[PDB]
């Protein structure tokens, strides 16, 4: 599924340069759009 980009940081561990990551969706992007872009809060 589509997801926001997760950003990684380079760390020097065990003599290796590791791109250690920093830090579930079931509804479609359209359902997320309807949920997030609801204007009822502006009324």
């Amino acid at each position: 599924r589509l997801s926001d980009q997760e950003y990684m940081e380079l760390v020097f561990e065990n003599g290796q340069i590791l791109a250690k990551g920093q830090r579930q969706r079931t509804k479609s992007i359209m359902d997320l759009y309807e949920a997030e872009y609801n204007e009822d809060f502006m009324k």
């Binding site: 599924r1 589509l2 997801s3 926001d4 980009q5 479609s28 992007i29 359209m30 359902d31 759009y33 872009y37 204007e39 502006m42």
Partner: protein, 476 residues
Amino acid sequence: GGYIQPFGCMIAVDESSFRIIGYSENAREMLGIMILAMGTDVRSLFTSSSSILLERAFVAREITLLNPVWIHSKNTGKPFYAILHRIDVGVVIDLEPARTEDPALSIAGAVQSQKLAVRAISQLQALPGGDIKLLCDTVVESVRDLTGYDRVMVYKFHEDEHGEVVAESKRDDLEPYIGLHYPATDIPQASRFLFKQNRVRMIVDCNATPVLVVQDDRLTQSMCLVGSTLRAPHGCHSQYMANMGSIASLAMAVIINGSMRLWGLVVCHHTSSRCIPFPLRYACEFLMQAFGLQLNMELQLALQMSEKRVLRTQTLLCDMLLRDSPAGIVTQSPSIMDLVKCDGAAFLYHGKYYPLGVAPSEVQIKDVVEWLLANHADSTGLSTDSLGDAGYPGAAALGDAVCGMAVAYITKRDFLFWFRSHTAKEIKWGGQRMHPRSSFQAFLEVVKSRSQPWETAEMDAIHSLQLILRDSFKES
């Protein structure tokens, strides 16, 4: 004039004077006017900023560079997305109401179209790059996630111009259509041309009553309501969609290098009326552009690898020719059957018959040779998609096992044959009224006794092997 879908509005105006020369019947209700009439200045129907944006779009050389103009009705203030395009007379404006009225949310959605397109294309990038089926499946999943339609499928248009459902992602309770084939006549060539021009075709509700477009009586010809995004589907396709059980549709053209070529479509179907907001439509459009690019890549790579494989097969056949007598090419694993895609092959050498796989009997092949000599004596080789169409008397005797047949001439008595069975052999699918099942049956009727067409590359390989074997025979 023509008819448009009731989910939007259409106003066609004179480019030089901005005077309205035509409009849809629902324009007044859509804009809250119910004034709007022939000759009315269109800029007076929208706010001042909307008029400025419309003028800027009008004077632009490439109007498509700003298609979605966010304008506001002067009366109600509701936002609309105006898609502007040029016709022979003036400029046509397709006004689709914007569900999101908050300006901040509108800007956020405008940027989210780009963000979602970028993320989907990034998903596409991660693919290894050597599998068209994987690419199609990934695109289908991405498009279903973005739009949320009940069905999303990829249609591939074959050289015959008939379509195949090469990928699909559907609701669990719907009939699958993957692997289906339908006749080329199901998509008229005019519709294919329009898909080439207007890459995205959206039908909100097939059963909705279309809206007439009243145009000025002073216009000589009917308004060119062709590139309009609100154009209503024809009765034939509307009834076809109703029978299929699909109410909403979102077709997107897949364009590759041919002058561009329409490789196929990515069509989304919904069991109920559906009209997704503009940000998602444009995210899908950008994803489709990237998909077309990568698909052209995959096709070119496939051609290169096919050439490489054919060259290796020819080299192995040359090695076999050098190692033993010519018949040895039809005795080892890398035989002529690997040169081209076929269901069988055969070698006639000094009156000796060497069949492989699905091939006719000795008497049948002798009859075929006699027919070839009678009708095609002056030929260095030929390819027939269907022996019945060519006119072979014994085709009915061969049946569906042998329908397509390619002959390479070595000499007056030695021949190479590549036999291919009828198409319905490698087409499997579950399934008068215009229905998917009827389309599949009609297609099977079209190719009843016809094999797959012999590709240009396949015939080039056959001719190359023919030249090599002719030189070897002359040496021997």
